Design a protein around this motif. Sequence first.
Motif, PDB file in Angstrom:
ATOM      1  N   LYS A 149      51.903  24.141  31.506  1.00 41.96           N
ATOM      2  CA  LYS A 149      52.500  25.482  31.376  1.00 41.96           C
ATOM      3  C   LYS A 149      52.105  26.064  29.751  1.00 41.96           C
ATOM      4  CE  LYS A 149      56.690  24.814  34.331  1.00 41.96           C
ATOM      5  NZ  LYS A 149      56.164  23.658  34.706  1.00 41.96           N
ATOM      6  N   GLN A 152      48.087  26.979  30.249  1.00 45.79           N
ATOM      7  CA  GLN A 152      47.395  27.664  31.537  1.00 45.79           C
ATOM      8  C   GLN A 152      47.225  29.204  31.217  1.00 45.79           C
ATOM      9  OE1 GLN A 152      47.394  27.091  35.648  1.00 45.79           O
ATOM     10  NE2 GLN A 152      48.354  25.239  35.383  1.00 45.79           N
ATOM     11  N   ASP A 153      47.985  29.911  30.179  1.00 40.84           N
ATOM     12  CA  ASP A 153      47.681  31.177  29.855  1.00 40.84           C
ATOM     13  C   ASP A 153      46.532  31.509  28.620  1.00 40.84           C
ATOM     14  OD1 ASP A 153      50.197  31.396  31.211  1.00 40.84           O
ATOM     15  OD2 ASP A 153      51.454  32.264  29.690  1.00 40.84           O
ATOM     16  N   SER A 154      46.149  30.191  28.105  1.00 41.65           N
ATOM     17  CA  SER A 154      45.141  29.984  26.953  1.00 41.65           C
ATOM     18  C   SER A 154      43.803  29.705  27.780  1.00 41.65           C
ATOM     19  CB  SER A 154      45.383  29.167  26.075  1.00 41.65           C
ATOM     20  OG  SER A 154      46.541  29.804  25.169  1.00 41.65           O
ATOM     21  N   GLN A 156      41.487  29.034  31.638  1.00 40.76           N
ATOM     22  CA  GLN A 156      41.234  29.226  33.076  1.00 40.76           C
ATOM     23  C   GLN A 156      40.894  28.029  33.685  1.00 40.76           C
ATOM     24  OE1 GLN A 156      38.330  32.489  32.893  1.00 40.76           O
ATOM     25  NE2 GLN A 156      39.185  33.379  31.109  1.00 40.76           N
ATOM     26  N   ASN A 178      41.189  32.788  27.292  1.00 38.05           N
ATOM     27  CA  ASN A 178      41.786  33.812  27.249  1.00 38.05           C
ATOM     28  C   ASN A 178      40.984  34.549  26.123  1.00 38.05           C
ATOM     29  OD1 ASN A 178      43.191  33.537  25.001  1.00 38.05           O
ATOM     30  ND2 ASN A 178      45.214  33.634  25.817  1.00 38.05           N
TER      31      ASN A 178
END
Length: 195
Positions: A149, A152-154, A156, A178
């Motif tokens: 978590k 996973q936003d930083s 791919q 990202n």
Amino acid sequence: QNTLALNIQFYDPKQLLSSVNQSVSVPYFKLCQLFLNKSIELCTKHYHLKATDIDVVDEFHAEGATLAISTSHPHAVECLLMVGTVFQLLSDVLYKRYREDKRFALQTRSAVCNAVEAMQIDAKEAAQRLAQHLHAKESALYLDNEQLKAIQDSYQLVAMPNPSNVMTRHAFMINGMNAECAELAQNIRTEILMG
């Protein structure tokens, strides 16, 4: 164990490490280690950590390099992944430059892992086992649900291709990052190369 490990290995499909001269391989391993030390220094600085907060388990040698960090440190996961990302960018620059100069050089691959519960192995062993199945310039990770978590936003992430063993059936290939992540990695690479 509250530990994360980064393992880096050379991709050597022609087994050139089995015949390369010590006079060429020794300085090459040291240059890879110097670039990795510069990555540790600027990535830890960015995350308010000290270079010494990352353990140098194995310095660069023919079988690779291993780093570790305690998860007790804030930003441990983001910091160690960034160290691997920046090192991979520096490694690609070095490889392209040496090949142009007809000098010995190899591409690298890397993995960041936490301990694997199903396999009953620690982080260092997991990172070494995952990196051994990667190809040139690839990066992968194995992280627990909480750690995924946090990144996973930083990054791919995609499933590993044609997985053939338990380690590769559990890991994720890093397919990209990202905008914020890419800018930071490039800026650190530039600071290390320029000056």
